[PDB]
Design a protein around this ligand. Structure first.
Ligand SMILES: CCOc1nc(N[C@@H](Cc2ccc3c(c2)COC(C)(C)O3)C(=O)NC)nc(-n2cnc3ccc(C(=O)N4CCCc5ccccc54)cc32)n1
Length: 342
């Protein structure tokens, strides 16, 4: 059952992978691992291989590693990054230290596309549709991304897209320009429609070519947002359980929702309509992914028999308070239990 492993050093790091993976070539200085481009001789696919660094250094990190592996083992969808392989050179649990992950090699993020390319309404349709198809799947598993943004979106030459990666929030930084107001300002217990807000921001950026809410801080970004969508009504104010947040909002001069047709001049009216149903301040009233797939803006791509949902995602491990060795053992279980796609 054991494939033969071989060793090589790639910038002060020993990589031990099965013989099937060839021409390993470093590609990105990550923060939870190093990543190589490789060629998988068995599938004939070009693959990305990640070596998780310090995966079991503390209870926190060992749980994170377990969670990571669980999410990826579970995500089986065309528009969501899943796992072609996972392996360890270790022959037993006692020597088990390293986790390697294998997935499809993707050419660029969406940032590297919207910066370089000029996007027709047709390309925007296909990209957004793909995001929504992936989200419908993610949300059906009771997972919220929380941080959808162009650098989390992998695209290749065919414009095929996959969703990825479910002080750093301070200033004029992309890290915050796509967050929903209620998650950015902790208004309430937020739901999965925070991701729909993010899609709205992304979609707008693809159409206009510029960031929709390039706030220079939390307050400035709120101001940009409300300038477009209007200040909260009485009903939405009730739902903002944070007394600190609610009191601040009421201090602002009230504003009406702007006419979107006047902001995004020249755009497809159907794109304008969809944006209006995505960028609704009240998260309860936002369009869902499943609903957005049926919007007439995607009538050319929409396929109700080819927009699948997810298997039950057993997430009950989150409540668990275990020791390092116990998370690591559960991780090892998920490693050896892995069955590749057909
Ligand atoms: C750490 C990032 O470093 C990095 N740099 C480059 N550089 C490319 C250009 C480029 C630049 C940015 C960029 C993309 C490309 C593609 O989409 C995204 C959004 C990544 O952004 C280049 O120079 N090619 C010449 N490519 C990649 N990469 C390429 N396919 C990847 C697939 C997944 C991931 C991954 O993170 N996971 C995480 C969990 C799942 C998993 C499982 C196994 C392995 C990695 C992973 C990384 C990938 N990662």
């Amino acid at each position: 059952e054991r494939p033969t492993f071989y060793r090589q050093e790639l910038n002060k790091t020993i990589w031990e992978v099965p013989e099937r993976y060839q021409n390993l070539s470093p590609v990105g200085s990550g923060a939870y691992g190093s990543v190589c481009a490789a060629f998988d001789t068995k599938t004939g696919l070009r693959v990305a291989v990640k070596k998780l660094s310090r995966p079991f250094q503390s209870i926190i990190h060992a749980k994170r590693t377990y969670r990571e592996l669980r999410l990826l083992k579970h995500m089986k969808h065309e528009n969501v990054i899943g796992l072609l392989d996972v392996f360890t050179p270790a022959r037993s649990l006692e020597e088990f230290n390293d986790v390697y992950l294998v997935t499809h090699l993707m050419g660029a993020d969406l940032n590297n596309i919207v910066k370089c390319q000029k996007l027709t309404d047709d390309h925007v349709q296909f990209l957004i549709y793909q995001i929504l198809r992936g989200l419908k799947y993610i949300h059906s598993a009771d997972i919220i991304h929380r941080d959808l943004k162009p650098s989390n979106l992998a695209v290749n030459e065919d414009c095929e897209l996959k969703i990825l990666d479910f002080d750093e929030m301070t200033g004029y930084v992309a890290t915050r320009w796509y967050r929903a107001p209620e998650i950015m300002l902790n208004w309430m217990h937020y739901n999965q429609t925070v991701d729909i807000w993010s899609v709205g921001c992304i979609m707008a950026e693809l159409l206009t070519g510029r960031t929709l809410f390039p706030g220079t801080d939390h307050i400035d970004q709120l101001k940009l947002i409300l300038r477009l969508v209007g200040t909260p009504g009485a009903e939405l104010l009730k739902k903002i359980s944070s007394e600190s947040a609610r009191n601040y909002i009421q201090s602002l001069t009230q504003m009406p929702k702007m006419n979107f047709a006047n902001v995004f001049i020249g755009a497809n009216p159907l794109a304008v309509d969809l944006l209006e149903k995505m960028l609704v301040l009240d998260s309860d009233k936002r369009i869902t992914a499943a609903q957005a797939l049926a919007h007439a803006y995607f009538a050319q791509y929409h396929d109700p028999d080819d927009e699948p949902v997810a298997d039950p995602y057993d997430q009950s491990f989150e409540s668990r308070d275990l020791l390092i060795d116990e998370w690591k053992s559960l991780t090892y279980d998920e490693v050896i239990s892995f069955v590749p796609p057909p």
